[PDB]
A paper describes a structure:
Voltage-gated sodium channels (NaVs) initiate action potentials in nerve and muscle. NaVs are composed of four pseudosymmetric, homologous domains (DI-DIV) having six transmembrane segments each (S1–S6), which surround a central transmembrane pore. In all of these structures, the central PM is composed of an extracellular vestibule, a narrow ion selectivity filter, a central cavity, and an activation gate formed by the intracellular ends of the pore-lining S6 segments. The poison dart toxin batrachotoxin is exceptional for its high potency and toxicity, and for its multifaceted modification of the function of voltage-gated sodium channels.
For structural studies, we used the construct rat NaV1.5c with deletions in the DI-DII and DII-DIII intracellular linkers, and the C-terminus (rNaV1.5c) in order to enhance expression and improve resolution in structural analysis. A total of 86,763 particles were selected for refinement and 3D reconstruction, which yielded the final map at 3.3 Å overall resolution according to the Gold Standard Fourier Shell Correlation (FSC) criterion of 0.143. Therefore, our rNaV1.5/BTX-B structure is most likely captured in an inactivated state with the VS activated and the pore closed. We designate these two BTX-B receptor sites as Site IIB1 for the site in the DI/DIV interface and Site IIB2 for the site in the DIII/DIV interface, reflecting their functional roles as BTX-binding motifs in Neurotoxin Receptor Site II. Moreover, F1420 adjacent to K1421 forms an orthogonal (T-shape) π-π stacking with the aryl ring of the benzoate moiety of BTX-B that likely provides substantial binding energy (yellow). The binding of BTX-B causes local induced-fit conformational changes in the rotamer of some key amino acid side chains. Notably, F399 and F403 from DI-S6, and F1667 from DIV-S5 adopt a “down” rotamer that allows for the binding of BTX-B in Site IIB1 (blue: Supplementary Fig. 6b). The binding of BTX-B to both Site IIB1 and Site IIB2 appears to stabilize the π-helix conformation of the DI-S6 and DIII-S6 segments, and the α-helical conformation in DII-S6 and DIV-S6 segments near the flexible gating hinge GGGS locus.
Residue numbers in the entry: 11 to 32, 53 to 210, 216 to 435, 700 to 945, 1190 to 1780
The structure:
Amino acid sequence: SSFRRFTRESLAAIEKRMAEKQPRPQLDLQASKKLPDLYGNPPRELIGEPLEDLDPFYSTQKTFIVLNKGKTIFRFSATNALYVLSPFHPVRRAAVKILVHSLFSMLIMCTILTNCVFMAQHDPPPWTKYVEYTFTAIYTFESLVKILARGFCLHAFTFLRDPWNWLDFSVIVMAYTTEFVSALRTFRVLRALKTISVISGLKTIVGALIQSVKKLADVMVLTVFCLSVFALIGLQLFMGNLRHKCVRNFTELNGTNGSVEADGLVWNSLDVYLNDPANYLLKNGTTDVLLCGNSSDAGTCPEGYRCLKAGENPDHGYTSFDSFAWAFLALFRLMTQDCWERLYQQTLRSAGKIYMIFFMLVIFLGSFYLVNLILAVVAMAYEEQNQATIAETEEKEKRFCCPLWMSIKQKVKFVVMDPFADLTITMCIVLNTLFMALEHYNMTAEFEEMLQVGNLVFTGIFTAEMTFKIIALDPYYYFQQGWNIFDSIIVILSLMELGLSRMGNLSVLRSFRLLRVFKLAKSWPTLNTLIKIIGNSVGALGNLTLVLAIIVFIFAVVGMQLFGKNYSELRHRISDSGLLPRWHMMDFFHAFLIIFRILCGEWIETMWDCMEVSGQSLCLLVFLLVMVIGNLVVLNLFLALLLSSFGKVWWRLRKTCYRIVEHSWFETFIIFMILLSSGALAFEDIYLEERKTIKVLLEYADKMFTYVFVLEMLLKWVAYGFKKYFTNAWCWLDFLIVDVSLVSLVANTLGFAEMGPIKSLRTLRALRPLRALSRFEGMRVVVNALVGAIPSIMNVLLVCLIFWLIFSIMGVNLFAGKFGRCINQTEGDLPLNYTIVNNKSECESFNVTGELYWTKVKVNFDNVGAGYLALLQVATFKGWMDIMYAAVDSRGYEEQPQWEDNLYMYIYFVVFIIFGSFFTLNLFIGVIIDNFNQQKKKLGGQDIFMTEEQKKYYNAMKKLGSKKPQKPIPRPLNKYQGFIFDIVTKQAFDVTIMFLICLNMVTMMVETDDQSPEKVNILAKINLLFVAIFTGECIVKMAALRHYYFTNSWNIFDFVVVILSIVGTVLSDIIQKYFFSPTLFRVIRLARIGRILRLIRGAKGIRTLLFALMMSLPALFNIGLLLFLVMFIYSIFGMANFAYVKWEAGIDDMFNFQTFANSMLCLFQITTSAGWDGLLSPILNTGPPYCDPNLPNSNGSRGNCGSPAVGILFFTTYIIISFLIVVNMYIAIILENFSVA
Ligand SMILES: *[C@@H]1O[C@H](CO)[C@@H](O[C@@H]2O[C@H](CO)[C@@H](O[C@@H]3O[C@H](CO[C@H]4O[C@H](CO[C@H]5O[C@H](CO)[C@@H](O)[C@H](O)[C@@H]5O)[C@@H](O)[C@H](O)[C@@H]4O)[C@@H](O)[C@H](O)[C@@H]3O)[C@H](O)[C@H]2NC(C)=O)[C@H](O)[C@H]1NC(C)=O
Ligand SMILES: C[C@@H](OC(=O)c1ccccc1)C1=CC[C@@]23OCCN(C)C[C@@]12C[C@@H](O)[C@]12O[C@]4(O)CC[C@@]1(C)[C@H](CC=C32)C4
Ligand SMILES: C[C@@H](OC(=O)c1ccccc1)C1=CC[C@@]23OCCN(C)C[C@@]12C[C@@H](O)[C@]12O[C@]4(O)CC[C@@]1(C)[C@H](CC=C32)C4
Ligand SMILES: CC(C)CCC[C@@H](C)[C@H]1CC[C@H]2[C@@H]3CC=C4C[C@@H](OC(=O)CCC(=O)O)CC[C@]4(C)[C@H]3CC[C@]12C
Ligand SMILES: CC(C)CCC[C@@H](C)[C@H]1CC[C@H]2[C@@H]3CC=C4C[C@@H](OC(=O)CCC(=O)O)CC[C@]4(C)[C@H]3CC[C@]12C
Ligand SMILES: *[C@@H]1O[C@H](CO)[C@@H](O[C@@H]2O[C@H](CO)[C@@H](O)[C@H](O)[C@H]2NC(C)=O)[C@H](O)[C@H]1NC(C)=O
């Protein structure tokens, strides 16, 4: 009834309606949406035909509606298209019929996919010109349909009205313009964006992505403000420090126009001499110029070398603090924590070791807090649209031999359904995934046969279960749920591998039997959650994954044809020695890998190579665009998955010691000893034997510490009950520590020192700091929080252990003994060509001069135990470079590697990261969030990481943030004071002050290392004007008030910053006429960022976000008290174990474990899980030709080798322990951010 064929009388009626016409359309009637069944199913004769409009909102105007077989509402234009085409024209009727046809949409979709394939081919064949013409013809043909059906721009719903249709018009007009330097074809890849327009599902997701980034202006402004403020701090502190180089010593010849000579050569001038790169000193191992510093903490050049400022720069010239432009980039990289340890070591080496305080604040105030603030908002923004989407569903519902065969069929059915049969199958699955885990590199004939024989017996059992199941219930009913389907495909996949094994030279399908371990999800709940996370990404979140896949492909082909030509021609400017670059862009597969590497968080490493090849300006835009856009989609996908898927004497003495134990003076006495005993541990450096008076003093102190603590335990034992002491977990912790100390002391006095087990027990003195946990309530409440999560953490670790067991066994099968390289020690650690040494047999054949060592990668796939460490390094993105490089080079069993031979081994590492590092991490954070949410509810809706006293202060300080607008200040009746009051209280005065802050902020970015005296004087004069006017505006605003400086707390911040600026601006003039400050002048110069910090008053969004950090300050302090204690404990472990190790990649002469100061620097670097692979490598190696045992050492030890056993345990546990504590910090801000919203 409602639907009818369009008629001219109906058009005239709509005209009359518009006539007397000269407040919201219905959601259910919007375009590209399904029509409700209330109006009725359109007849087959009316589908694809013009029908009158249904919504009264558009009834006034000339609009009409069509529907397809799928009943999608389409609103076209009824006004004359192109001024000649009436809506009733037969050609227009044919055009609109083909526009709504679902077959037409599939035609465009298939064409785009074919075009996307043809755009990924570098150096296309010359016959593709017709294909480009055909794609141009098709795209113009479908574009002409829109013009022939809707108009061009004139009437409401038209072609160039929806923003997405501009893309099609731009593509066709640009394609024809090209048909009417060759790098301008990069615009043709925009045809891949048309996929989003074709699929209606993808369009809404893109709209959701824009909304997510729209709710980020306050955070993005704060992020830019924080980075710019920190850049000015870094600029004024390390201005030109990175240019320090160990220039060779020289002497100046007398006369001869000031010529300078080297040891044997002569240079014309000092400028020419020093700028030469052949007289510097390269760092050991790497090809890096060794930085230095005149400070007492920075590095030192060896004999014959001196520290001089002049030089080019580190990292080809792109890593410097000389200008604000470089300072911003060098600190945005710190914000992302992409290779930040390289800048961490370079700045400490050049400036000094004390400057790690600056890196601590940048990593916290700029990286840890700000990135988490970004992630907190995206989760908040998604929760807002998720609620609305669910709300739109709620309102929709409110409105609305045969008898023998049968006899044996039921008999086997009885056996199959029996629960013991299923349990044995699960037990068989567990054994099968464990028997085949007994795979290593150096096998034997018997072991390989036993493992091979075990394959058929396990495969044969599964076939019998499948054979019995297909006949038991029903052949058709057997398929049913996918659990039965999944078993069928896997069991027949193994049979294909076994049948192929007769000719199976390349057998890898046997590694797919591990997928049967997923059958354990029936009983395991956590395994089910992991499957649901993966299923949601391909299921309900299919569109979001498709958008990410589409975006990654586009950025892969954008860079392939933009930098592909330059990479091939200028490969020598980025080649290691003489070969191709490892990460180039001349091929699509390598182009995609760089995009994937950028998504993983490593961008600047490949940015330097591209900037040195193609162009600095262009490479900066593309690499940063994929960094912002790529992470925005990935973070949206990661957060979407997480939220969607989730006698009287005895009595008398007992009372006396009870009183003394409970006395407060006793409690602080023990705390004093706990801190002192922990402090003396760090004193045992490698120079202890040199200091004769400190080694005996520490030994006496150790005796006193173990005598006081024993007395304390005895007093508690006598006073408190035996059950009371042993029922307290904290008291048990102290009991073990003292027991270890007592055993070591009693063994030393017994004359049984320096033995095997006793000497290992002395190292366990590093657990002495653990006694401080039970005393400070700030740390005890944090420990109480992580103890409650131990059952939840253990469940996730088992699932990740099973998930990583599949990849480790599969990785062992793919690579086992293929990581061996026959290196030549005379040259260096460089694999040789196969034209000389082909395998291990040939390497030993030429082993006549004793210089060919068949070494192997320290972290490799030789067995499941060794494979677990490699997966950990790959998943953590630390040290994975040396794994993929040695894996995409494998050339068979015990064969010499070749450049990119077996190149597609990169796919194995990419898939693992998507599954074992992305989805696995998503499961862990989801469980931890769920667990700690339960603890908050269990505790009574109170913060978990906060003490009782801190709660009072935080609650009291929370009320301080209440906005209570006070009454206006009375006008002073001094005429002149009243006049200045009127011109000051006006808000326009604050705008002028705010404008002056930006000008002062701008004039500090002009600072550069190459500062001429004329530029210095002009800037000094400009600063003098700024400090004068600011004092003037402070002296007139205060003059009007004169009695209420206490109120408006921002009015005291500017008063002290002006006084500080007044002190600074007069000391600088004094300093020029007084003793020159070597480094104190930098501080007073740098103390001017207070003016920049005055912008908080005028920014509401910035102030609110900063208020959340102040809320989370007491919570973060408690968590950080524990992390530093753990870092302190591990540092003492490092000095006792990893001292006197060979200096190598991660262990320089300044970042070793010899001293507490040096070990503290290393552990802070590993706290962010950065560069832990580089530090682990010098411990893993043992024996020649890498290490050299039987080497004399000062502290009794011998040999500079490493300990692979404890070296792996030390770094693996600390990486995990730090991550849990860091995660505790990530959510503490989020909960505070959610509450403050
Ligand atoms: C090719 O041919 C060479 C020479 O025959 C082989 O090199 C030897 O390989 C064996 C193992 O197969 C090594 O034996 C090991 O020796 C350890 C004791 O240390 C020995 O060398 C120490 C000297 O230091 C060496 O390394 C440093 C660098 O760290 C160099 O600067 C030195 O020049 C030395 O090369 C000394 O203490 C002393 O010489 C020791 O003998 C021992 O702890 C191990 O258990 C093992 O027995 C041997 O050291 C290697 N070199 C020597 C001296 O012969 C090479 O393996 C062959 N490669 C193949 C596979 O073809
Ligand atoms: C964050 C994540 O990815 C990145 O690092 C990353 C960096 C830049 C851009 C994008 C991503 C991690 C890499 C691996 C990891 O490494 C430790 C340090 N990181 C910070 C934490 C992660 C995640 C952790 O849950 C953990 O992953 C596990 O699979 C499960 C539990 C885990 C503790 C186990 C051991 C190491 C893990 C194994
Ligand atoms: C730098 C940063 O590291 C990370 O946690 C981190 C996490 C993820 C990625 C990268 C890095 C820190 C986060 C919190 C911290 O504790 C953790 C350990 N680090 C080394 C030191 C920081 C910073 C410190 O200034 C400190 O922050 C405070 O808020 C103020 C002073 C502080 C000493 C107090 C106690 C602990 C702090 C509390
Ligand atoms: C994630 C979605 C929105 C896709 C984003 C794609 C853009 C990052 C690409 C698409 C087209 C590209 C442009 C295509 C062509 C050129 C011309 C090029 O200059 C030339 O004249 C060619 C090179 C030369 O000869 O020097 C500079 C880069 C630029 C603007 C490219 C910049 C990067 C663009 C905008
Ligand atoms: C009963 C359940 C709770 C046991 C859980 C054990 C797991 C925590 C796994 C994870 C990693 C495993 C380790 C991985 C590798 C090895 C090396 C393995 O020794 C070798 O085969 C040498 C390998 C080499 O160095 O080449 C001995 C077992 C061990 C310590 C494994 C012991 C069991 C571990 C700790
Ligand atoms: C290992 O590397 C060296 C080069 O560092 C190869 O060349 C030898 O180098 C030494 C020292 O310069 C010369 O004295 C020899 O005459 C060189 N031998 C030659 C010509 O090969 C050395 O050959 C390599 N080791 C091998 C392959 O035995």
